[PDB]
């Protein structure tokens, strides 16, 4: 497929794991469809490092910013591809990332491992605790008190 | 001319500069392609940003850009 001609055609604090570098390279190659040197093939397909940062952060051990992803690609992967990242990824056999998760599980396990006088006030009120009043009598006392309060108010 | 396009606040000055550049483009008596390009790029950057409300100035500049793109000599430059 050849794009049609237009009027404008001129006639890092945590270390990067091999899985992160591999995701970065594969995002740039597959999604952006850009070459190693990011030379523009189609004018509309300008590099999008936000998408690459999103792809890398799907499996990264820490948030990688778009600027960090661009800097890493240009300063490591281009010189490395010019052992290749694919060869290092194949030889690692996921050992480093497995050991990372083992270490995290160990830290989480470490954190998990590191984990009478009452009658006096009734007698002052006038309540014989040992001779309960049934609810009918208490309701009658409430009614009498309310009636006396109403009479006092009147 | 570049400082007039960039900093000058008077829209009449900008219209005069655009007229001068249009006369130059539509014509050693005329500026080189590099000078025309510099002036047109400065106008493209500052005229719209500094004078959004001036419809006549923007129309004159867009008419000049239209002539440039219609011109066969400058096509593909």
């Amino acid at each position: 497929v050849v794009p049609p001609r237009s009027l404008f055609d001129r006639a890092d604090n945590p270390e990067w794991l091999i899985s992160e570098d591999w995701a970065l390279l594969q995002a740039v190659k597959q999604l952006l469809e850009l070459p190693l040197n990011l030379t523009i093939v189609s004018p509309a397909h300008t590099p999008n490092w936000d998408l690459v940062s999103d792809v890398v952060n799907s499996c990264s051990r820490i948030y990688r910013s778009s600027k960090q992803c661009r800097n890493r690609y240009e300063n490591v992967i281009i010189p490395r591809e010019e052992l290749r990242t694919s060869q290092i990824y194949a030889q690692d056999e996921n050992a480093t990332h497995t050991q990372l998760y083992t270490s995290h599980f160990d830290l989480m396990k470490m954190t998990a491992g590191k984990r009478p006088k009452h009658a006096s006030v009734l007698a002052e009120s006038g309540i014989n605790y040992d001779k309960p009043l049934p609810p009918i009598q208490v309701a009658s006392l409430r009614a009498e008190r309310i009636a006396k309060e109403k009479k006092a108010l009147a | 001319l570049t400082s007039l396009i960039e900093k000058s606040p008077d829209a009449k000055i900008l219209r005069a500069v655009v007229k001068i550049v249009e006369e130059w483009v539509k014509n050693n008596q005329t500026p080189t392609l590099r000078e025309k390009s510099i002036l047109l790029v400065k106008m493209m950057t500052y005229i719209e940003k500094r004078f959004p409300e001036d419809l006549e100035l923007n129309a004159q500049f867009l008419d000049l850009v239209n002539y440039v793109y219609r011109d066969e000599t400058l096509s593909g430059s």
Side-chain angles (χ1 to χ4, degrees):
Chain A
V1 189
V2 289
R5 292 190 176 188
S6 88
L7 301 159
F8 324 113
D9 307 356
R10 191 177 170 184
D12 294 348
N13 305 103
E15 296 291 336
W16 284 71
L17 303 194
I18 185 59
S19 53
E20 297 177 283
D21 274 336
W22 180 238
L24 171 55
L25 175 62
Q26 290 289 69
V28 176
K29 192 175 176 67
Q30 298 186 20
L31 283 50
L32 307 179
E33 299 205 338
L34 291 166
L36 183 159
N37 49 6
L38 307 169
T39 45
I40 282 174
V41 185
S42 307
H45 307 166
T46 302
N48 187 348
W49 292 104
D50 287 6
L51 170 66
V52 173
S53 173
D54 186 275
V55 172
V56 173
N57 287 321
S58 306
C59 64
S60 75
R61 73 171 181 147
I62 198 67
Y63 182 82
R64 309 296 191 177
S65 83
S66 57
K67 192 175 65 178
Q68 281 177 332
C69 292
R70 183 175 78 83
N71 282 349
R72 178 81 188 185
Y73 182 89
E74 293 189 32
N75 298 329
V76 190
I77 297 188
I78 291 184
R80 184 155 67 203
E81 299 310 308
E82 188 172 57
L83 283 82
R84 295 173 189 84
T85 310
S86 59
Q87 289 169 262
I88 308 171
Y89 184 80
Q91 284 181 8
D92 174 70
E93 293 192 324
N94 318 114
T96 301
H97 208 161
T98 303
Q99 182 66 359
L100 179 81
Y101 288 113
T102 294
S103 307
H104 287 146
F105 298 165
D106 280 342
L107 288 167
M108 288 184 281
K109 194 177 70 171
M110 175 191 69
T111 289
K114 279 173 174 176
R115 298 180 194 133
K117 298 181 180 180
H118 274 210
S120 74
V121 70
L122 266 60
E124 285 179 19
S125 195
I127 297 168
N128 191 339
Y129 181 82
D130 285 321
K131 294 186 179 182
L133 272 64
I136 304 293
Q137 287 182 241
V138 189
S140 185
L141 287 179
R142 177 184 181 176
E144 282 198 41
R145 188 187 67 77
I146 291 170
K148 284 160 197 175
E149 172 186 319
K150 285 176 177 181
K151 186 179 176 181
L153 286 169
Chain B
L1 290 183
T2 287
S3 65
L4 291 177
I5 292 155
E6 182 171 57
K7 290 183 287 188
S8 180
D10 196 3
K12 300 167 62 72
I13 293 282
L14 265 292
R15 292 169 183 220
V17 171
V18 178
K19 184 167 162 55
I20 285 155
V21 176
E22 166 179 18
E23 285 172 10
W24 279 341
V25 169
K26 289 187 169 177
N27 263 273
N28 44 34
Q29 314 285 352
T30 62
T32 57
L33 195 58
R34 191 176 68 237
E35 295 149 319
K36 295 170 180 180
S37 297
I38 285 164
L39 293 165
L40 290 172
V41 165
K42 282 285 184 286
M43 283 157 50
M44 171 187 80
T45 303
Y46 291 111
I47 291 184
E48 178 160 302
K49 185 176 181 179
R50 304 201 309 112
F51 305 92
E53 302 297 324
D54 207 338
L55 292 190
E56 192 165 29
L57 174 66
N58 284 278
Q60 189 186 355
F61 171 56
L62 293 175
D63 283 349
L64 174 58
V65 174
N66 168 68
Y67 173 82
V68 166
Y69 276 92
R70 286 180 188 249
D71 195 1
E72 295 94 345
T73 304
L74 309 185
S75 69
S77 64

